[PDB]
């Protein structure tokens, strides 16, 4: 109807990454060889953030309920691409030995299992929220003062721009999935769907914007 | 039937919205990489359109009626991306700051609210209606006088006519709307089909035009 | 079975509509700039056909029976495109105006419109076929000795000869159509399937040859 | 099950044949411009027997039985395709007249129907195949010692090589097609799978290794 | 549920297996002309995984059990094509014969053919276990020491360390399928699953980033 607000944003969001998915592909003429595989994440994040959204809907519509076992199934697919994003931009702009790479990989995989974990009830929930939390602590530091920083110190100022924004982007926009697991341990997937729309379509048009931008200039 | 003209009307401009979707996304060949985006959301908002079109006309068949929530929907989607359009070729033909795009998007956003607040009854009709043509008068101004025609005045004339054109466009075709929300708050699907055509295939083909022409000369 | 020999023309025209489809917009890599919307347009105009006999042949299995209607719709929909086909020729080839870009257009709009009139029982069969049979007369004329001949006889012999057997498509392949109309009002699914073969295949096959070999040469 | 051996064959040349329609498709990046037409031409011929392959796919799960019918629809399609390969690799590598494509396009069509007309029991079986073996047999000897001959002997020893693998081909594995005819009027659709996986995924990478080969070198 | 975690897998690879497909077609951009068809193929792969993935899936929801036989299938068309990854990086940075591809080719297929007979009780078991496991040792060492290896001698160093790490993927990651026949005749389903992830993507990876790594420097 007119007051769920649910599925109308299931609705809105499908569209949005749809068109992102299209977006991110098609735009990768307007950028040079080096940033083509960061616009190919992009869109390929979007693309399966929207597979897995029809599926979220179609299980929605037959028995209306929380999709987090698959959101934690996309949440596996997708974040290792969003965090690999600075790896890709960083190695586009200069050099990166890709134990960055690796670090963040581990970092986001660990966060992600230990959610599920406290999420299905195999382990104690604050143990769980607690490592998971740590690990998203460790990326974030990685991000704001270990290898991703120093790599990030000598790159052009439009490129560290971008790096800024999307730190910032994973810093709060990315801490909406721990309030969440909190507040549901202690509407959440309309909050869940807008999440999506600025950590999944911000995040991948600040990486063609500068993309873009770098290639042209 | 050969009399409703109203699911007729349906398939026609469901046909033609996916064969624009196809030709602008297919004509980015012959532009230059400064109008490839414009070309891109030529595409994705007809490609949209064509998306909510579709489940417009599945919601018809099964219990006929307006599909105005999803008109929102598709609205919220694509008029950010038209109002976007003027932004783009300004960029793609001169120097615009930005804060353009930000303004425009702001205005849009903002109609498109209060027009749904209008239209189920959050919000009381008259000041919804009120707003949201502020809302569009706004624009039409800062297309008109403001940023938007600054920048226009240092074009080509070849983008200057487009720009005309497509200001045009959003004072006449766009005028449908609100004089609909006046009609019905004091045939109809018909009438918002036969716009559509008007507003986002004669609008996509005037940037193709443009473009093309200032790619080739 | 193997009597009705109408389902089975379906069948083959839907494959070979959907196969001269792809061909067109994939080989626009052979043909220059130039000539990419002319193919562009060959391929779209073969996909909506190929999509309006997809239904076609839904509503023929549902409940056998003419699909005029449907057709009066693909053809509004691609009578334009071909015949706006002469004007991609020409000015990919020399110049021309635009003003026979209009004038084909409205011709050919009248003509569909009249014709429409004429089998819906709207006007009069007799005054709406003569008005229509005006119309294609008048294209015809355009096409044999007004602006489009006056654009072609500064082209060169290979887009002459292009130029020659559209128009000879035109005047022979496009009269089946009339010729069925004055039958009705005074078998044909199947000679408008086979009809189309020639007028939407071979006609983007011309095209095809003499932009790749102008492209080429 | 895993004794019939017929549904199989038909998933494993489905999916042959997708994967050989997306490889003819993609792999036009690596060739020249005249030998991408004879790549797009081994796509759409996979292409259309995928297609028709699906649906003989279905009327088999439906009522298990032949298709002849729709093979011969597909035949008709596809052959006329292979036959003109030849013509386009002798143009892609050297000079041909197009007399060679339009006798060869007659013969296969001729070959065909008269195939269908003994198959249906229009016509009288042994007269029906006498024409449809000697126009197999007449495009035999215009590809062996008449108009290809003489174009292939002044091609390039990779083209020509090509050109006599493609000549057996036609003699052999083409030749599985009259014998199934014969023994039917005087297992089928399992040898008619494998027959296929030869005769259009084969023939399409001896045309694809010849014209990545000449355009490297 | 969140307890069977293998329909859980089917997801999780099937999406997994899209986005590679996608990849592996999208990023040709990036490399050569000479890895362009390395990179084709790591995308068929993949591609004919999925697609094949898919009706395992639609077999397990109807009636849930082993697809093995469609597992033979799907290896029977995608064993090949990995085995020809080694040909095509060897080609594309040296010179190879080509008859390391056939025999290659004819050692997948006879370790395919005998490891199915043995499955399906044609042949005993044991003997075709040896047979199998005879024709993988005869790849293993083909690519270890014989003609693979020696091509693989004069190759660039970045070349050289893809093919050791294709070598180990094929002695380790491979090496868990004859594991599993052993022991089913002498779970299965999620390891089969999670076996594919990397022998097909991480595969494909390495292949695209020696080709990305080669075209760049
Ligand atoms: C597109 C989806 C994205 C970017 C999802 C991001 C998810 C997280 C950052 C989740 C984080 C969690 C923790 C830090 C600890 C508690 C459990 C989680 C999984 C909810
Ligand atoms: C493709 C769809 C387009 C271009 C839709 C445009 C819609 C508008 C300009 C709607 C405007 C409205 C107002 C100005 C005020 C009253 C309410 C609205 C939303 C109908
Ligand atoms: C692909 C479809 C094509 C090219 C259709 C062409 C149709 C016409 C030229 C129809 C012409 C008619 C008249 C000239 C007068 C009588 C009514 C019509 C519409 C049948
Ligand atoms: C992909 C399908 C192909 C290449 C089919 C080829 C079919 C033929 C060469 C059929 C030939 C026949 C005769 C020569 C005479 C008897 C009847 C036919 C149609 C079976
Ligand atoms: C994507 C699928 C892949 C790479 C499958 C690989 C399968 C094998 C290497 C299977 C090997 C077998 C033997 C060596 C002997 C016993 C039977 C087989 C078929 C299981």
């Not at 003429?29 to 595989?37: C, E, L, M």
């Not at 953030?49 to 076992?69: C, K, L, Q």
Request: proline content about 2%; overall charge neutral.
């Amino acid at each position: 109807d007119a007051s769920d607000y649910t599925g109308v944003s299931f609705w809105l969001v499908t569209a949005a990454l749809l068109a992102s998915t299209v977006f991110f592909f098609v735009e990768r003429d307007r950028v040079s060889a080096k940033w083509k595989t960061s616009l190919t994440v992009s869109g390929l994040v979007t693309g399966i953030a929207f597979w897995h959204y029809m599926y979220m809907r179609g299980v929605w519509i037959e028995t209306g309920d929380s999709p987090t076992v698959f959101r934690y199934i996309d949440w596996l697919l997708t974040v290792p691409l969003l965090i690999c994003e600075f790896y890709l931009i960083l190695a586009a702009a200069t050099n990166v030995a890709g134990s960055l790479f690796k670090k963040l990989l581990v970092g986001s995989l660990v966060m992600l299992v230990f959610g599920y974990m406290g999420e299905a009830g195999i382990m104690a929930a604050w143990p769980a929220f607690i490592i998971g939390c740590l690990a998203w602590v460790y990326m974030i530091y990685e991000l704001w003062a270990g290898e991703g920083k120093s790599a990030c110190n000598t790159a052009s100022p439009a490129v560290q721009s971008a790096y800024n924004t999307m730190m910032y982007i994973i810093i709060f926009g990315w801490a909406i999935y721990p309030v969440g697991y909190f507040t549901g341990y202690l509407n959440l997937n309309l909050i869940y769907n807008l999440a999506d729309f600025v950590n999944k379509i911000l995040f991948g048009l600040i990486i063609w914007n500068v993309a873009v931008k770098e290639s042209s200039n």
